Amino acid sequence: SDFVGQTVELGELRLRVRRVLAEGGFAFVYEAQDVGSGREYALKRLLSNEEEKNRAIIQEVCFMKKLSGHPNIVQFCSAASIGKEESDTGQAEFLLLTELCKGQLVEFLKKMESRGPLSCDTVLKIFYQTCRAVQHMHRQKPPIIHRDLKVENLLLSNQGTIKLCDFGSATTISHYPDTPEIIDLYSNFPIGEKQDIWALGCILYLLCFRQHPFESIPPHDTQYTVFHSLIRAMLQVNPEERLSIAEVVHQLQEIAAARNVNPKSPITELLEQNGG
Amino acid sequence: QSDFVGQTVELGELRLRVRRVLAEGGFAFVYEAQDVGSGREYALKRLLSNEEEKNRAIIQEVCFMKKLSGHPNIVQFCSAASIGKEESDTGQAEFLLLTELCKGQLVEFLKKMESRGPLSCDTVLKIFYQTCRAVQHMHRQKPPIIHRDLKVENLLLSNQGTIKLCDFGSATTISHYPLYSNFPIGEKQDIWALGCILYLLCFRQHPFYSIPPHDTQYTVFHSLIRAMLQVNPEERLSIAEVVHQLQEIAAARNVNPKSPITELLEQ
């Protein structure tokens, strides 16, 4: 692989591939710059030799496009595909172009470790903005379930706000039509939301206490008390007793209003630091 | 455990007497049901769930059944309904899927025919064509619906003596589909599974291969078997090509391959 250095055409864009930003399973992510305009992007390149992988990749692209437009989701810019024979890999090649963020949230959190625990207001804004993204997913008809919510996948935008970008594990119901009860487009069964709520509860716990919860709230904590009932309500062992994302977001708004915080605003205490 | 036989279940205007069990398994049981007000008979599938992942898979199955209904080789969807965990007698979410009642499972009828010797090429042709036509309807959707569990044991025979597909519990597709229609997304594995069915109908064993060296009866099918069972998925025929070849075979045998499979229907 030396995709770095190449130029890639996507519609009217001519993108110089500047460097690698991230790698792993299906895919690598690069920094790219459009020659005509100077605009900068993240370019994800996913390779497939197999029809099951084709389906998963195309599904990811559809979710990115569907969810784009929310302020806490990365913006979808464009996508393209190269057939196996016409590609330089001898594989199907998929190119997904999105907004370039400042970097991964955890890189900015590392910088704070030497200084001290995060303020409750910083936690509040990170977690609110994350939960707002998840809300936008769960409110779709039918709901889109993320299934892989983790702190290490969250991005910080250039404006200092959280962005979700990893829809490779997401799922929903296809061909949803937009005494027992006849099934209506007005259905009220959970279809995966509750596991996203649990995963978010783990994020909250980790943001406050800086340890992973499964290996209870630390008995001597008095700094993050404001979040204790939410943590307990999201980490209920029985999925059906967990809050919905609407209730989670409502509670975080109440908390923000009571703390004089606009929870949508830039997380400036991270944005003073370096992570990408 | 079927306390359910003998109950009456209301689904809108239907009042369905649950007459007996037809089929069972992990997810679900299937019952014969009869509407009191009309005398109409149905298959009633009852799917129980204690978890959200299963709720999703169930509702997905219902959505596929409803989307595919209307094709002559797909069981007809009639209605669906749910009972919440608390209001249900199981202490679980209960889903009820009501469809057309078929005559029975295809393999039951094939068993009866064993006594009479190998199936004629015409019978194989009609069974296989009608199966492939159902799969074609799936693969032609935009985006394609992939079945993923095609097997001879799951095929039904209708009351008119035609093949019906009914098991969409393993199916998948792409949601929120908008540059992409050239990529296979699972069709080739359905093709392989269908090739196994054709082989099994002719030679009465599952290929897993090799076409039996001494066969001269089913020669007309040999290349289609080989073309569907290619080791490399991308070298396998599409379902459109498969159907085209079966139609040519039919026309050369003077057979309307959509018509009732009468030789099964007298069993």
UniProtKB/Swiss-Prot annotation, chain A:
Associates with cyclin G and CDK5. Seems to act as an auxilin homolog that is involved in the uncoating of clathrin-coated vesicles by Hsc70 in non-neuronal cells. Expression oscillates slightly during the cell cycle, peaking at G1. May play a role in clathrin-mediated endocytosis and intracellular trafficking, and in the dynamics of clathrin assembly/disassembly. It comes from Homo sapiens (Human). Belongs to the protein kinase superfamily. Ser/Thr protein kinase family. The gene is GAK. It is found in: Cytoplasm, Perinuclear region; Golgi apparatus, trans-Golgi network; Cell junction, Focal adhesion; Cytoplasmic vesicle, Clathrin-coated vesicle. This is Cyclin-G-associated kinase. It comes from the Eukaryota. Ubiquitous. Highest in testis. Residues 15-253 form the Protein kinase domain. Transmembrane segments: none annotated. The active site is at 148 (proton acceptor).
